Amino acid sequence: HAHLKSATPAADSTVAAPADLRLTFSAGVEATFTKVSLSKDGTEVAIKGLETPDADKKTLVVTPAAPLAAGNYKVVWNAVSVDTHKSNGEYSFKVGQ
Ligand SMILES: [Cl-]
Ligand SMILES: [Cl-]
Ligand SMILES: [Cl-]
Ligand SMILES: [Cl-]
Ligand SMILES: [Cu+2]
Known part of the structure; x- marks a missing residue:
């Protein structure tokens, strides 16, 4: 996991x-098997890419299509580990005005 x-x-x-x-x-x-959803006050935010740059694959870099504008963001994640096991969560953050 x-x-x-x-x-x-x-x-x-x-x-x-x-x-x-x-x-x-x-x-x-x-x-390739992990999913990440980004939304700004209900509005789905386009993501251009997912990638694990490091050998250990422990960090997932999520690249938006456009630079993030000020607002309230929610991240919903569904991870697939190298053992094929699934985990999921969510969290929020804000991009300061
Ligand atoms: Cl998204
Ligand atoms: Cl991090
Ligand atoms: Cl997992
Ligand atoms: Cl984040
Ligand atoms: Cu596991």
């Missing part, structure tokens, strides 16, 4: 326009 240890932007934090989201897990995850 892959449990979410931390994320940037951090849950319930307020940040200036981040370039991407970075979700760090307790075991490797598979970008």
Whole structure:
């Protein structure tokens, strides 16, 4: 199983326009089988790419199609670990005006 240890932007934090989201897990995850939904006050936000840059596959980089505008964001994640096991969660953050 892959449990979410931390994320940037951090849950319930307020940040200036981040370039991407970075979700760090307790075991490797598979970008090809993992799903991530991003929404801004109900509005689905386009994601252009998912990728695990590192050998250990523990960090998932989620790249929006467009730079994030100010607002309230929710992340819904369904992770698939290298052992094929499924985990899921959600969290929110804010992009400061
Ligand atoms: Cl992270
Ligand atoms: Cl995040
Ligand atoms: Cl999305
Ligand atoms: Cl998992
Ligand atoms: Cu498992």
